[PDB]
Amino acid sequence: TCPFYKKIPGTGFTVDAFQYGVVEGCTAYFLTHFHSDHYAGLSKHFTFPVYCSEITGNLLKNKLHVQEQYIHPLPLDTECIVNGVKVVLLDANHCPGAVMILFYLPNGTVILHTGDFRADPSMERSLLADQKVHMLYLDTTYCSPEYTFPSQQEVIRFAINTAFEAVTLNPHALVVCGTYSIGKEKVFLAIADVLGSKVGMSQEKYKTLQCLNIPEINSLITTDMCSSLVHLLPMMQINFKGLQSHLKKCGGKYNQILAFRPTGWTHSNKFTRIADVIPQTKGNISIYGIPYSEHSSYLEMKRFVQWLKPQKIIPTVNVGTWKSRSTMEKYFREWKLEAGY
Ligand code: NI
């Protein structure tokens, strides 16, 4: 059964609710982004209207085989009427094709559903600026002050400089980057660009990337692993055993691996600056964990909410325990008392 925080009151709409069977009273199913916890349940046999971004719709059609007649892509930053209700999709600064959804209810209530997002001050000048929001359905993944991490630009600077130094010292070094979903493509594209290489990967991953409307992508990626010195592998293979094994396969072309694991937050964030990050090493293999996040830090979240001044907050993440829920509700009240709304 579909939980309440996936339903939009006063509509026939649900958000990211594909794993509950036919939801009683739902006339349109919205999908915020192509991540498995959110799309769980979609397939070629789905026969209800799905509303999403263009990029999400490419992935539904080519990866899950959903039939074209049930895919309804909407442009961003554009007022659209869906089953008699005005909606707008906004960029969520999450993975490719990820959106927030603004719903303008027939009774005058305005609801923002963030999906998964990384709040940014640029959002304070979107179509959000133009009216009041009553209810906020909020990605609370990192809603606690211990969760700090650097900007995406500082992390990519660290990665490019690390990779370029290593391969200039040793032209026979291979760089490997882990992946298990869409998102974080800047990691591997930036390093390949500094090295003058395409990124090599499996056919299944090349197919996924070809659905993303990234400019000039044919110039940056390839399935010919032999011609590439940046390889993508599944995140589970980024360990000493899996990397030793991969290095065998390259036929003595390479004699060293430098590998990156873009994680979210890890507790090494509480003590160490990005400048100070060191790898784990074993022999001719080094593994860097880099804190590249596509979710808001605690401070980015707080700034967005204090700017928006919603009348009510509904968390969408960490809702399964009473301790989490009580912690989140305490921070929400702090933020409201500090800002005065
Ligand atoms: Ni996500």
UniProtKB/Swiss-Prot annotation:
Biological processes per GO annotation: cell division; double-strand break repair via nonhomologous end joining; interstrand cross-link repair
Q: Which GO terms describe its molecular function?
A: 5'-3' DNA exonuclease activity; beta-lactamase activity; damaged DNA binding; zinc ion binding
Q: Does the keyword Zinc apply?
A: yes
Tissue-level expression reads: Expressed in brain, heart, kidney, liver, pancreas, placenta and skeletal muscle.
Record-level GO cellular component terms: fibrillar center; nucleoplasm
Q: What upregulates it?
A: During mitosis. The mRNA encoding this protein contains an internal ribosome entry site (IRES) in its 5'-UTR. This 5'-UTR generally suppresses translation while specifically promoting expression during mitosis, when cap-dependent translation may be impaired.
Key words of the record: Cell cycle, Cell division, DNA damage, DNA repair, Hydrolase, Isopeptide bond, Metal-binding, Mitosis, Nucleus, Phosphoprotein, Ubl conjugation, Zinc, Zinc-finger
**Which cellular compartments is it found in?**
Nucleus
The job of this chain, per UniProt, is described as: May be required for DNA interstrand cross-link repair. Also required for checkpoint mediated cell cycle arrest in early prophase in response to mitotic spindle poisons. Possesses beta-lactamase activity, catalyzing the hydrolysis of penicillin G and nitrocefin. Exhibits no activity towards other beta-lactam antibiotic classes including cephalosporins (cefotaxime) and carbapenems (imipenem).
Instruction: Tell me which family the UniProt entry assigns to this protein.
Output: Belongs to the DNA repair metallo-beta-lactamase (DRMBL) family.
Which proteins does it associate with, and in what oligomeric form? Binds constitutively to TP53BP1. Binds CDC27, which is itself a component of the anaphase promoting complex (APC). Binds PIAS1.
What is the recorded name of this protein?
DNA cross-link repair 1A protein
What is the scientific name of the source organism? Homo sapiens
Gene, per the UniProt record: DCLRE1A
